């Protein structure tokens, strides 16, 4: 007897239904189906979940339970044998700036977050999990395979805690397990403003009727603002350097300080808000704080949607853009906003675009200081390098002048992420993002590689030879078969990323399809999509079609030399122009007048 729906977390909201602005939680976007796309609800399922016991257990959880007749290789084993590489020479992307990779994480953070199980309120089950590699309940450690170097130095496994699921955080069983999406599915700047009420209201500066976002009161960037500091027992950022004592930042999204270039882009967007809110007071001295806040917030979301859809997607996707994301024909309330569960893994193609180093550049876009270039892995949860070493201006230049890493079937994920990842409660710079991606692929009950090739109307290889043909790599196909034994068993993250990139894109056909369908949905299914008639006026959409990431930098930094097209590889000074040459955002259409 099928069910209409599940009822634990949700004190329900009324909906204004006259309302102009999006809610903070995403609720009320779809009038006939309120909760669609709202934070803290189940990630949507495009295909039924596939677990080892049909309900919630991990393929690979029980030694004896095979997937289609074969054991399901250890995540860290797939990582070692396939994902890793030694030589960082030549892996750079000749036609994608480092911003390409960065916007990707930004957009991704705007769309989805599946935390680990809230059941962690003064327990040792985390330390027991950590210490003796005892699998049980939500502790699902990543076991090291034999001959794994980390055995000589780290122990027998790597922490890992299953994702939050719906209708509790403790006991459940009776139907298939569904993981939670803690942020709104809409492209709406929830990473800047937040997805709950605590949080939004508290990022805000309410002492002054100007609708500013609260800023750091304890540090300045040559007169420019920094996000406020955070508040936890264990701040990660402090932990990585106990002498410096610099806290992580407080943003609408939780992960803001995971890495220094992500905190940088966050710092960037928070300035755009206050800049808009300030130019909005100058233009409208009567508008109160909430009106300034909400209309700045409106505009910021529109900027994110445009840079993403106009500049970003066309070059992830390439020749498949026009197959999945056609010209926008208007708000369609029949579409499902919801970020699917598989998309949260598909969008992880970004992990293969992160290079091994990050640079600080000075005004002439030459090395800044004596330790200009830094090992990626020393910048996890690193805020001190920003506050007490130059601000964001040198880092933003590197985002423009340096390049992204290029996905390469023989060099997938840099060791800075594959062996040196820092996670916020554990002590070492010794984790593996690729192994975690795979373990999480199964924690979430993802169907295999062929289930998705089928979903996308693509062939489903059954033999080495077939897979060779699809991967266009004999040796990669070989290692996969040796590891998984049937194309059927290949985890979607790695199978999806094993495919050669499409014409003029950076993902293969399978991911082009998975990503292409989702972005089409979050656009068409948004009542507040910026280009939907009503949302913005006649002259309002005209001023907005002029925004660019180059202008965002120009207005929120003291940089004055930027590329016109920030996402392609840009070389200084030839590919760089002066800020005066770049179109500004004309706020004149926001003018309401009265008597
Ligand atoms: C450090 C990390 C990064 C940079 C140095 C980084 C970068 C990205 C980019 C460039 C992405 C897409 C364009 C992207 C996507 C998603 N990530 Fe990733 N990422 C770093 C680290 C992490 C870690 C840690 C996680 C959590 C892993 C887990 O399963 O526990 C992570 C996840 C994701 C993810 C799913 C988010 C969610 O929906 O839960 C992406 C879409 N990344 N990252
Ligand atoms: C919320 O908004 C208020 C008002 O904008 C913020 O206070 C204002 O902050 C500015 C810059 O931080 C201050 O300007 C200058 O202060 C320095 C040193 O304190 C001084 O040398 C100058 O005289 C100059 O005024 C200013 O004091 C202050 N303005 C007012 C009217 O109070 C406040 O910081 C914001 N709160 C948060 C949490 O962001
Ligand atoms: C480096 O990458 C550049 C971006 O991927 C690429 O330039 C792009 O060329 C394509 C091919 O005509 C154009 O495609 C876009 O055309 C217009 C946009 O002007 C849109 O209406 C279409 O939907 C489509 O997205 C672009 O004009 C152009 N990209 C940009 C941002 O201008 C270069 O060819 C690459 N450089 C090298 C040396 O290979
Ligand atoms: C933890 O953070 C420390 C900062 O709180 C950092 O120490 C600082 O490192 C800088 C280099 O970035 C040193 O400054 C350099 O340049 C200045 C120029 O004025 C010179 O005075 C110095 O001789 C030096 O060449 C600072 O000396 C130093 N500051 C302090 C208070 O020690 C640590 O390196 C960080 N440790 C880790 C593990 O990240
Ligand atoms: C709004 O969105 C829906 C998607 O849910 C679109 O739907 C359709 O396209 C076909 C028209 O050629 C219809 O025959 C199908 O019923 C439908 N397909 C799917 C997957 O829904 C369509 O653009 C809009 N729907 C309506 C009713 O206008
Ligand atoms: Ca969102």
Curated annotation (Swiss-Prot):
Compartments it resides in: Secreted; Cytoplasm
Effect recorded for residue 108 to V: Partially bound heme
Chain positions found as Phosphoserine: 198
Gene Ontology CC, one term: cytoplasm
Catalytic residue positions: 109
Site residues (Transition state stabilizer), renumbered to this chain: 255
Glycosylation sites: 95, 205, 241, 332
UniProt: heme b binding residues: 108, 258, 351
Domain of life assignment: Eukaryota
GO BP term, example: response to oxidative stress
Cofactor binding note of this UniProt entry: Binds 1 Ca(2+) ion per heterodimer.
Disulfide bonds: 6-167, 15-28, 129-139, 133-157, 237-248, 456-513, 554-579
Tissues in which the protein is found: Mammary gland; milk.
Statement: the UniProt record of this protein carries the keyword Lyase: no
Record-listed Ca(2+) binding positions: 110, 184, 186, 188, 190
Effect after changing residue 108 to E: Partially bound heme and decrease in activity. Loss of heme binding and activity
UniProt keyword list: Antibiotic, Antimicrobial, Calcium, Cleavage on pair of basic residues, Cytoplasm, Disulfide bond, Glycoprotein, Heme, Hydrogen peroxide, Iron, Metal-binding, Nitration, Oxidoreductase, Peroxidase, Phosphoprotein, Secreted, Signal
Keyword Disulfide bond (UniProt): yes
Annotated protein name in UniProt: Lactoperoxidase
Cofactors: Ca(2+); heme b
Residues found modified as 3'-nitrotyrosine: 365
